[PDB]
Amino acid sequence: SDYMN
Amino acid sequence: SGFWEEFETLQQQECKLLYSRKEGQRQENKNKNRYKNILPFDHTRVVLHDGDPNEPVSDYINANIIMPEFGSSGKKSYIATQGCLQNTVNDFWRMVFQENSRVIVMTTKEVERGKSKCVKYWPDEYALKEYGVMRVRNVKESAAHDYTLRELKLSKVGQGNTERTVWQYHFRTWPDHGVPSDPGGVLDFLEEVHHKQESIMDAGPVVVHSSAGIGRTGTFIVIDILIDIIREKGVDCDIDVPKTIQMVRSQRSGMVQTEAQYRFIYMAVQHYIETLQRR
């Protein structure tokens, strides 16, 4: 759901 | 120091995202985004025409045109996009066809550490597959140390005289974490990408993708932009990494995600310069 990288 | 201050200053200016991203937020487009918070700016998004009339929203893909300069031709531009989802494979090929793209840069494996970064959107070697209205033949694969080249031929099912070759440069060795410790592989790869693209007249923008379409995607694109400036204006021309990142960030938010990617960009440019001086 959220782009950590 | 120096790189951290430069990268942190860039990250400052993006703490407010100013340009509108309303289309990506529409209920119909929710499951066309891999990540809820990574969305294309409306004004540079790739608008998909000629969609199925029965689909109420058929014009959306999580992708933006990136121009290196304000008057850039389509041939000198890029499309930054996310890796295909299971339900956007057909939209991806509609985009490639409509924009007349002839070169695709894939910066990830299909799966990394058990997580999908890109659903396979190409047939096996010598096989043919239909993706919605588009037909794709995989004509040949060539393995290199760091990448595989897939020579694909894309056409619209039924319609004659719509076939064109699309060259998929699939970078295979990018590490699961961090960045490569040496830019040699990426530079040789981008050299093949560029010579392929320049050899096709009336080619559309080069498509570049990663899991979100911003991190690895921005790193590859910015390196390609900078070495092409050096190609055109020589090794003592002035290079402004921050301003170039600012330029691409004004067209898709968040391009170049980590300070390691930032340092990798500088290293790649310095290596490219060194390669031309050192024969």
Residue numbers in the entry:
A (entry chain B): 189 to 193
B (entry chain A): 4 to 282
Q: What sentences appear in the manuscript?
A:
SHP2 tyrosine phosphatase (SH2 domain containing phosphatase 2, also known as PTPN11) has recently emerged as a key player in cell proliferation and immunity, providing an attractive therapeutic target for cancer. SHP2 activity is regulated by autoinhibition, unlocked by recruitment to specific pTyr-containing motif pairs. Here we present a concise structural study on how the activity of SHP2 phosphatase is controlled by an asymmetric, dual phosphorylation of its substrates.
A highly similar RSRLLHSDYMNMTPRR motif has also been described in the T-cell costimulatory receptor CD28, where it plays a crucial role in T-cell activation, proliferation, and immune regulation. This CD28 region has also been shown to be regulated by SHP2 (recruited in trans, by the PD1 receptor). Our solved crystal structures clearly present SHP2 with an open WPD loop, despite the catalytic site being occupied by a phosphotyrosine peptide. Likewise, the other two structures show an asparagine from the substrate at the same position (+2), stacking against the similarly dislocated pTyr residue. While the phosphotyrosine was tightly locked to a single position in both the ppIRS1 and ppCD28 models, the phosphoserine remained flexible, and was to be located at a broad loop region defined by Arg362, Lys364 and Lys366 in the best models. The same models also suggest that the highly charged N-terminal end of the peptide (the −5 Lys in ppIRS1 or the +7 Arg in ppCD28) can simultaneously also engage in intra-chain contacts with the phosphate group, further stabilizing the U-shaped conformation of the peptide ligand. As expected, the “Loop” region mutants decreased the proportion of Kd(p0CD28)/Kd(ppCD28) to the highest degree.
